[PDB]
């Protein structure tokens with residue numbers, strides 16, 4: 001058995017405040033003897049609009065460097081290793097700007113106990129949706145990724161990584177299992193409407209489809225994305241402020257048979273951590289008994 | 302603006318004549334309820350005791366199908382009203398199969414129109430070869446030969462129909478292909494086990510519905526099956542010890558909208574045959590696809 005921690009939190013537009021929360025969760029995870037901690041999409045910030053995101057993305061590299069230092073500090077202080085999977089934003093590179101692509105990068109970092117970034121997964125499927133009872137277009141601020149993420153040989157086993165919308169495209173999850181995934185993660189900032197309808201369904205489905213443990217770290221609650229300093233500098237009227245967002249939470253861990261084995265406590269309000277012990281022998285037993293990957297029709301599909 | 306579907310739940314025996322009677326009653330009920338199409342489960346002609354039994358019964362299936370074709374035209378004529386029928390049956394191996402040393406039966410999903418014309422015979426692609434958790438070892442491939450073709454989209458009275466069977470549901474790329482080809486409605490006629498049914502039946506149907514943004518129809522076998530066949534047991538020189546033929550199906554037949562909402566579901570208080578009805582809404586389906594345009598947002602540059 002190996003221990004995973006899944007974090008649930010509520011990002012503001014203040015990267016400093018968000019970093020403090022992130023650090024506390026990582027510290028809690030080490031104290032609870034988790035070997036890896038998984039944090040949601042956009043753990044560095046959430047923004048009011050594309051202009052705001054571009055402004056905040058400039059601050060993200062410092063957030064990441066301070067986080068790297070904080071992990072090595074926490075590991076050394078507690079005398080125990082932990083790896084961190086965390087959703088952040090990155091600003092466009094110098095080359096991107098020259099090519100006329102001034103969009104930010106929605107990225108999932110895997111940072112090991114040495115504070116080294118082992119992977120930077122850039123979100124492949126962008127959330128451009130008329131949410132059933134606001135009209136969202138992530139591609140107005142965000143640039144899509146160019147590559148399928150490699151499987152990570154984590155302390156928990158073979159890990160396949162994805163972000164939010166990615167979960168809705170089953171071919172991605174299937175590919176990660178084909179590449180050797182035993183564990184999938186979907187750090188997310190889900191809406192209330194789609195969360196109530198599909199969050200648990202999609203997580204359990206991916207787990208059952210792929211015979212993988214599935215980790216679902218989610219943003220939760222009502223966000224306050226106000227940023228007086230940005231609002232002043234860009235000369236905003238209060239009428240064009242868009243600082244309210246709300247996220248579904250219900251962060252969970254699902255076993256390869258679709259059983260929810262850990263779930264966020266709905267009665268606790270702030271950031272929270274959930275723990276699960278993962279069983280490699282149960283995973284192997286499920287795959288042995290129902291050998292889906294020996295039964296696919298690759299000749300046709 | 303709405304189109305009515307009927308989904309049948311039944312309990313097949315090894316007796317093709319008895320099974321036909323039940324199928325005929327359900328189709329009759331569907332026409333009376335003004336369903337445009339009726340969907341029946343996998344193995345609606347028969348279920349068997351073992352691979353040898355299946356091969357023996359499959360020889361009787363062509364007669365079953367001809368009688369069914371005739372029954373449909375008779376029912377259409379007598380009610381002055383059209384219906385199409387989707388039904389899981391078995392078929393014996395072809396001469397070409399036999400020449401290749403393949404005497405296994407075909408697990409096929411038939412689409413039959415109101416004139417009794419067979420429009421499609423989809424031969425099941427993925428076969429149920431699994432060790433059931435706290436259950437029996439099952440190997441469909443011992444009795445059944447896997448298909449070699451992706452089923453064409455059927456332009457049914459309800460809309461564009463993508464067809465699959467049972468175990469096919471567990472392979473998301475199949476349902477994804479059906480939607481890519483233009484499906485608006487998916488069907489998974491099944492004979493699902495108790496153990497896997499309790500765990501995954503509702504999950505898989507709802508998942509496929511929301512994955513593909515299609516209506517999903519799930520006609521299921523239900524109950525403890527009577528696989529008794531005295532004349533065949535005699536012919537096979539089967540002892541009473543070998544005669545213990547136990548099989549049980551999950552049922553819980555349902556219809557699911559493209560958002561994953563269950564809109565019709567079998568009554569759990571019946572273990573016998575029953576029909577459920579649903580009105581399918583084309584506007585809702587198109588609305589969902591418009592608001593979340595998944596098929597405009599895939600990464601074919603990476604997956605394929």
Ligand SMILES: C[As](C)(=O)[O-]
Pocket residue numbers: 362363364366392419422
């Ligand atoms: C019994 As036939 C040859 O119409 O499938």
Ligand SMILES: C[As](C)(=O)[O-]
Pocket residue numbers: none
């Ligand atoms: C043919 As006998 C009744 O001896 O098994």
